[PDB]
Design an enzyme around this catalytic site. Structure first.
Site, PDB file in Angstrom:
ATOM      1  N   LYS B  73      19.443  49.014 -21.840  1.00 51.65           N
ATOM      2  CA  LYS B  73      20.036  48.382 -22.593  1.00 51.65           C
ATOM      3  C   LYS B  73      19.335  48.257 -23.294  1.00 51.65           C
ATOM      4  O   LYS B  73      19.011  47.886 -24.158  1.00 51.65           O
ATOM      5  CB  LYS B  73      20.230  46.704 -21.697  1.00 51.65           C
ATOM      6  CG  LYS B  73      21.345  46.142 -21.808  1.00 51.65           C
ATOM      7  CD  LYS B  73      21.554  44.565 -20.830  1.00 51.65           C
ATOM      8  CE  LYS B  73      22.350  44.417 -21.139  1.00 51.65           C
ATOM      9  NZ  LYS B  73      23.244  43.698 -20.055  1.00 51.65           N
ATOM     10  N   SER B 147      27.131  43.114 -17.429  1.00 56.78           N
ATOM     11  CA  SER B 147      27.183  42.674 -19.089  1.00 56.78           C
ATOM     12  C   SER B 147      26.520  44.637 -19.322  1.00 56.78           C
ATOM     13  O   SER B 147      26.463  45.152 -20.522  1.00 56.78           O
ATOM     14  CB  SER B 147      26.836  42.118 -20.140  1.00 56.78           C
ATOM     15  OG  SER B 147      25.425  41.813 -19.642  1.00 56.78           O
ATOM     16  N   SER B 171      25.429  40.458 -14.969  1.00 58.11           N
ATOM     17  CA  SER B 171      24.741  41.583 -15.797  1.00 58.11           C
ATOM     18  C   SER B 171      23.839  42.695 -14.712  1.00 58.11           C
ATOM     19  O   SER B 171      24.117  43.430 -15.860  1.00 58.11           O
ATOM     20  CB  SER B 171      24.384  41.341 -17.250  1.00 58.11           C
ATOM     21  OG  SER B 171      25.203  39.910 -17.808  1.00 58.11           O
TER      22      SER B 171
END
Lengths: 461, 461
Positions: B73, B147, B171
């Site tokens: 990420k 996310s 997330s």
């Protein structure tokens, strides 16, 4: 010729005395004492006599506190009595006893009533009440301590056998150093805040002023217990300490501040001079992370818990406040949640650094206060002078520590010096022991006359 | 004919294959995949080939992840690659690997690079990146989740063997339900946030997207460890669960919301229809205190941790923000510390009520998301529609719970349904087992093709 202690009341009763006589005597001592600033609400003598009588007929079975008189900081709900928190306009009349008052009154204890305090528990001086400053037991010029002021005075004078304070800053430990008493601060959660006006709500602890550790401790055990209606209540763990090999962190000498008190400075040293004849091994630790964390309580975002608590009244009647306390709460209005969360980021950091020092020591030995002030000095430096007192105290609840304050001696002026023993969470029952052996090594006396110390003496398990 | 799993890479290598071939293949799958929104920074092929080679000469001793490719990420610091958190102006080039990237790269794993995310980890949709929405693996119309969007896509497609997400809202669990994967959310503190852009700093957890529980778990154990530079880091406890007599709280039927998804509603039910052939005993619990606490994360004062984090940039360049995320952070400016502390007062309360329900159950079984949206539906209801997804998720870190998301089946449209297993703190190693036996009972397949599941299978201890 009564001794106003638990033991001292056992004996008066074991020898044909009555609770009724005890209350009559207590009310005699009160009516005579002449510090006008110990009380905000005393009961009717004939109210307390009629319940004294009601108790003399009862058995003392399941009553560890049969006919024992005690005082309550006027921020703790006692029913029958109004609660003001030293703010007249804030006054209300509780319908119900605060849990820990309930738990105690049922063990057989009796309330004469509500003691004076620093308004809304915001102080360490005792000066911030409209009902006036209480004073040290050893010199009317000097402050009782705060914020649980009239509650330590009451026990040290001998008006009552114990009192109930509250601690967030140092309010259940500093008054205990200034009137020669044992001040027990329980791990937060052990005792309910249900029926207590909130100060710093996440941090507030209900404390005990007593004659010995053994009796502050016992009163705690009766008041100690889970309260589902207290969001911050915690069921009792019971972690313990070593007494063979015990290490005792003191600050570094550079990290040993007294703000010009030569005297206390010499006396704290004396604690370490008489502590060598003990099974107490010394460690020099880094005190910064505690010092620095202590500063977050008023020099940080936490001072805003007080804003949540009283804030409404501050908008309804901001003049009704103690001008000092007022100046402190009205500045918290400028604090944002960014500031607040940022404050917990620093706390988490210092907690890491703290846990480092908790590896070098098993418990923390500190000057309860670096000094002590004349009342008039603080009527004129009401802020800077009050903050000095929180130098070794303010980190204790923020860091989930437990503490016990004990008398540690006296200086030439005849003013006492108290040390505090700070330890990790739930180490209450075994930290309590150490604070007895040390108290009985330094100034094995309590209260106004350095009276002899009530047995029993603490012994391990 | 490579299987892009840990096991699948063991075998390619145990059969005369090279890491170099693996990377070449991975880069082949990537260059072909054609969702343009999975990556923000892919490495040079030759950069990753030259280090593949460097690894093929090395022993695989002390390298539990020899030559394994994985994604990160773009809020986690990988050195050699810039970090943007999907906010171009926020871009920087880390000098050093985030700790958990360091711990993983040293076990022999390799980074192709930084996956797309909901900007600043503020979302559950995957739509809030200027680099564009990733999409479900099973339908381009539907959202990848958020996310940690491009990180779940990467593993489900088979570009990489695992990815690293981050969790605060959901997330690291929602993207795992929408692309048929195991999403492991560790107890907070187990994994360092050192070298992670902060979202809700007190709450952020670094998570693992994997093919099986056994492999998400192992990758966790390598990344798991105390980091003195992470104030919110916690050394690993290891509390455990019963597997004989195990109780599984589900919400009450009235407390079982799906926002109109008939389908998921029928499929969550199916979990309970196939869970009876299990050694899983059912309990119906009061879900309110979790629901109500979940609401505090954006419908409370906590959304302001994000304000501390990005706030400077919001003043320096407020246009450089995702308009939605922007509208969310700019409203946190109105929040005071009174509000903030008041929020923790609610949390403490709900925690008490939560602990009540934790007495009736040993673990919590929930719809990872009540539904799932088309991308265009959320380009037009970017807020209300995004919040629905946090209905069973947002309470988990606030309440110091641990969770594991697993695939739980499919609906007629061909869109999958994932459940999450939420448990108390540090119950990670034993909760992980249960989430295997259930995953291997409901939809014993992973990823884009419901590919077969990599051994080993989890077995107790």
């Amino acid at each position: 010729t009564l001794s106003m202690t638990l033991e001292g009341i056992q004996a008066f009763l074991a020898q044909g005395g009555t609770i009724e006589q005890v209350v009559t005597e207590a009310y005699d001592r009160i009516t005579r004492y002449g510090d006008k600033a110990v009380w905000i609400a005393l009961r009717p003598r004939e109210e307390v006599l009629a319940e004294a009588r009601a108790l003399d007929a009862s058995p003392a079975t399941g009553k560890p506190l049969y006919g024992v008189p005690f005082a309550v900081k006027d921020n703790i709900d006692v029913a029958g009595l109004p609660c003001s928190a030293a703010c007249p306009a804030f006054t209300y009349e509780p319908d119900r006893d605060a849990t820990v008052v309930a738990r105690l009154r049922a063990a057989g204890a009796i309330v004469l009533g509500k003691t004076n305090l620093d308004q809304f528990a915001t102080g360490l001086v005792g000066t911030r009440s409209p009902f006036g400053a209480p004073r040290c037991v050893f010199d009317q010029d000097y402050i009782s301590g705060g914020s649980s002021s009239g509650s330590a005075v009451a026990v040290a004078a001998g008006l009552v056998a114990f009192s109930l304070g509250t601690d967030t800053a140092g309010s259940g430990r500093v008054p205990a150093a200034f009137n020669n008493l044992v001040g027990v601060k329980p791990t937060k959660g052990l005792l309910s805040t249900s029926g207590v006006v909130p100060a710093c709500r996440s941090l507030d602890c209900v404390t005990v002023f007593a004659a010995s550790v053994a009796e502050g401790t016992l009163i705690r055990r009766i008041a100690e217990g889970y309260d589902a209606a207290d969001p911050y209540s915690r069921p009792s763990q019971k972690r313990r300490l070593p007494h063979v090999g015990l290490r005792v962190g003191v600050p570094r000498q550079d990290q040993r501040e007294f703000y010009g008190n030569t005297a206390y400075a010499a006396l704290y040293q004396r604690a370490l001079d008489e502590m060598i004849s003990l099974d107490a091994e010394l460690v020099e630790i880094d005190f910064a992370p505690f010092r620095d964390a202590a500063k977050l309580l008023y020099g940080g975002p936490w001072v805003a818990e007080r804003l949540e608590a009283v804030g409404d009244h501050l908008s309804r009647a901001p003049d009704s406040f103690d001008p000092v306390v007022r100046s402190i709460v009205e500045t918290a209005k400028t604090l944002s949640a960014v500031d607040a969360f940022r404050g917990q980021y620093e706390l988490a950091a210092l907690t890491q650094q703290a846990n480092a020092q908790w590896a070098r020591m098993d418990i923390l030995l500190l000057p309860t206060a670096p000094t002590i002030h004349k009342v008039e000095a603080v009527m004129a430096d009401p802020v800077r002078l009050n903050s000095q007192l929180g130098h070794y105290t303010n980190f204790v609840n923020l860091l989930d520590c437990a503490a016990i304050a004990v008398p540690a001696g006296f200086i030439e002026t005849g003013l006492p010096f108290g040390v505090t023993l700070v330890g990790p969470a739930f180490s209450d029952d075994s930290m309590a022991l150490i604070a007895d052996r040390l108290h009985r090594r330094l100034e094995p006396g309590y209260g106004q006359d350095r009276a002899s110390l009530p047995d029993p003496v603490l012994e391990e398990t």
